[PDB]
Structures are given as structure tokens and as C-alpha cells.
Amino acid sequence: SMDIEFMAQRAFPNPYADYNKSLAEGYFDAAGRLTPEFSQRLTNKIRELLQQMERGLKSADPRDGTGYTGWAGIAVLYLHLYDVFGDPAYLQLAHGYVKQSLNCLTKRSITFLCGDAGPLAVAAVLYHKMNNEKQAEDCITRLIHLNKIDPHAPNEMLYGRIGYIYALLFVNKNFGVEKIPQSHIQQICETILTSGENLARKRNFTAKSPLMYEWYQEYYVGAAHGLAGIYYYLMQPSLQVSQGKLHSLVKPSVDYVCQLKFPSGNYPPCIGDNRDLLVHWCHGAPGVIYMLIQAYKVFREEKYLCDAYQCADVIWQYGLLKKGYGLCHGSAGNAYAFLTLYNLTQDMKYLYRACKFAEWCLEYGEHGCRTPDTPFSLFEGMAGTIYFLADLLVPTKARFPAFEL
Ligand SMILES: N[C@@H](CCC(=O)N[C@@H](CS)C(=O)NCC(=O)O)C(=O)O
Ligand SMILES: [Zn+2]
């Protein structure tokens, strides 16, 4: 491309005035409940997009059942719709999509987004929502008996171990009961730790940073294939890291990555990388923030939170992506940043920015954006932009899908 020098080339000049009490009124009240007039627009655009999406999937690859770009992804969207809208046509649609995604298993990856973890974990909860334990319990055992498959697997989101964790947490979250024994989550989380300190020695960070992780011959900073993603998961009460192991091991590793940030506030794609232009959830501030906020939650130190703000100001400035409107690397996925901040801070400035990003999404296709490689997919495509819009309806429950927790 021509746009290789800096963030500003990748992005659109943000045209929206920044928050004040007055402008927020149009979007939400002092309770941060969205004006029905606004929910109405969001919700009309959702119905409108869903039509195009549904027509689009007719020509989508029958072969791909990934969360990331295939049917299981769409199943995910619909289960989230059936939740936000009660409309049982969504639970039907979801059923047809997990049906489809279960003919796509290749037994060759273990993550929610790119491997059999997606179709299985999603089919599990769907079959549950349909009062149908026969298959619910059947998918469970196949999700579990996935473990022994890539024993030398990586650690990150898309192919790594946290990616398989999420699939398990997703099931448990959606049953409420602990259907996957805690010990089985503990199994895998152990080996991700012991392997992150080994790597850290062999390479000699273990002084500068007790833990280290890599994938595809790089140390990945960000959320998709990276440290930020992996640490975020380790600071996660659901994983249960010893209060000591949390301070001894993970805290300084985290701090190492913080130290990594560009002057701009952004974060390098890769360790040693010094091209400052990716504002994606997959690479940069918009994915790094989840770690920062989760760190402020558990260590309660003003620097973590002060970085999150710093993330957000960058995303606010450079998050409207020429890339398009998707979750992995697009305006929708970027907006989720703001919601996560907002849900911690409660500072209405952030719920506002999220809304103003939705304002952009509502002009889907009006900007010159290249259409995504898979135009209707959860993560590169329309299904994701839609996902956000629906999630935004009720901010406090908004979670970046297939990841956030
Ligand atoms: N397949 C994607 C294109 C992926 C592209 O946006 N690159 C992603 C890969 S996860 C990101 O790493 N961007 C790299 C860059 O912009 O240099 C689509 O067409 O929607
Ligand atoms: Zn990406």
C-alpha cells in the first residue's frame, strides 16, 4: 500500500465533536440509558443490515465454519441477537448455522475463533437454549476431548491456548453452572504459565520480564496473537492465578509490555517493531486496552488506568479505519474499546464516544471502505459490525465478542 508511514493515513479524520453534557443528551440520559430515538435508529439499521447479511451468506463458503470467518461466527451473532431482542427467529437462524458449522470440523485447530472449539462450544449452548441435553452434553465431551490435539500448541487467541480457554469459559458462562470442571481449565492454564517462563529464560528476558510468548516467529504485543491477549487472560479471576504467581510472574510481564508503548500512546505490532500505524483490536491500542483495564482492576495502580485513557484518545483520534467497519480491525471493533473503559470508569465521556462511532457505522458503505475479504463474517465482516450495534443497545452488558469476558 501507499499508507505505510503513520496511523493518520490508515484512518479517517474523526469529524465528531468530543463529549459534553449537552451533546450526550441526544444519545443517552444521565443514567446512560440510550434515548429511544437513538435505539430506534441503531435497531432499524440492525434489521436493515441483517437482511443484506442474510442474503450475502448464501454465497459464503460452505466449507468455512470458523467463528472468525464462518458459520459458527454467524451462529454467535444470532445467539446474541436472540438475547438482545427475544425474537425467536434469531434462535432458529442460530440453529441452522451451528448445524452448518458442524460439517466443517477439520480436527486441526483448538481455538474458538479458528478451530473446532468454535462450532462445538457454540453448538453446545445453542442445543442448551433449545432444551436438548442430548447434543448439549455430546458437544461438551467433544470440546473437552479436544485438549489432546496440539500439545505443542501456541498460547494466543486465534491458534493458541487462551483461544481454547475462551471456548470453555463461553460454555460455562452460558450454562452458569460450571459444566467444564475448574480443574480442566487449571490443567491448561498451568502449562501456559510454565511455558511462558521457559521461553523467557531460553531468550533471556526473565530478568526484564518473567514471562514471554511467541507465535509465527515473533513476540506479538497485541490482543489477537499477542502478550496483551495472553496476560489479559491470566489476570482473569476465572483462571485462578496464585496471588503470588500473579505478582511474581504476570504483573512485571504486563509492566514490560506497558513500557513498550509508542510516544503516540499506541502499541507496536511486534517486539522490536517500530512502525506505528496499526490501530486494530488485533494490533495496537484497541486490543492492548483490555489488558491495561484488567490490570487496573487487579493491581489498582493509577498508571494502568492512565494508559487506558491514553489508548482511548488514540483510538478516538485514529480508530475510524479505512480498513472498514469490522471487529478484528475496523471501526466497530475499535469502538468496543470505549465501552470497556466506560464500564469501568462509568465516565459518560466513553459511552458517548462509543455512540459516536456507531454513528459512523450507521453510514456503513458511505465512506469508501474496501469491502472485507469475507464481507459478512463475524470478524472481518458485517456480522461483527451488526454485533456491536446490537450490543451497544445495552452498554453495561457489552462484551467484545469471542474474547472479552
Ligand atoms: N482478511 C481481512 C484483511 C486483513 C487485513 O486487515 N490485515 C489484518 C490481519 S489480522 C491486520 O493485521 N492488518 C494488517 C495491516 O493493516 O497492515 C479482510 O479483508 O477483512
Ligand atoms: Zn486484524
UniProtKB/Swiss-Prot annotation:
**What does the entry state regarding organ or tissue expression?**
Detected in erythrocytes, brain, kidney, testis, ovary, heart, lung, placenta and spleen (at protein level). Ubiquitous. Strongly expressed in brain, spinal cord, pituitary gland, kidney, heart, skeletal muscle, pancreas, ovary and testis.
Q: Which organism is it from?
A: Homo sapiens
Q: The organism sits in which domain of life?
A: Eukaryota
Instruction: Report which reactions are catalysed by this protein.
Output: RX + glutathione = an S-substituted glutathione + a halide anion + H(+); 1-chloro-2,4-dinitrobenzene + glutathione = 2,4-dinitrophenyl-S-glutathione + chloride + H(+)
Q: What is this protein called?
A: Glutathione S-transferase LANCL1
Q: Does the keyword Transferase apply?
A: yes
Report which gene this protein is encoded by. Answer: LANCL1
The protein's GO terms of the molecular function aspect are: G protein-coupled receptor activity; glutathione binding; glutathione transferase activity; low-density lipoprotein particle receptor binding; SH3 domain binding; zinc ion binding
Organism classification = Eukaryota, Metazoa, Chordata, Craniata, Vertebrata
Quote additional remarks. Answer: Was originally thought to be a G-protein coupled receptor.
Alphabetized SMART domains for the sequence: LANC_like
Q: Which GO terms describe its biological process?
A: carbohydrate metabolic process; cellular detoxification; G protein-coupled receptor signaling pathway; peptide modification
Give the protein's biological function.
Functions as a glutathione transferase. Catalyzes conjugation of the glutathione (GSH) to artificial substrates 1-chloro-2,4-dinitrobenzene (CDNB) and p-nitrophenyl acetate. Mitigates neuronal oxidative stress during normal postnatal development and in response to oxidative stresses probably through GSH antioxidant defense mechanism. May play a role in EPS8 signaling. Binds glutathione.
What's the impact of mutating residue 323 to A? Loss of glutathione binding
Q: Which residues carry the post-translational modification N6-acetyllysine, per the record? A: 148
Assembly mode: Interacts with the C-terminal of STOM. Interacts with the EPS8 SH3 domain. Interaction with EPS8 is inhibited by glutathione binding.
Which key words are in the record?
Acetylation, Cell membrane, Cytoplasm, Membrane, Metal-binding, Transferase, Zinc
Fetch the SUPFAM superfamilies from UniProt.
LanC-like (SSF158745)
Where it sits in the cell: the answer is: Cytoplasm; Cell membrane
Q: Residue positions of the PTM N-acetylalanine?
A: 8
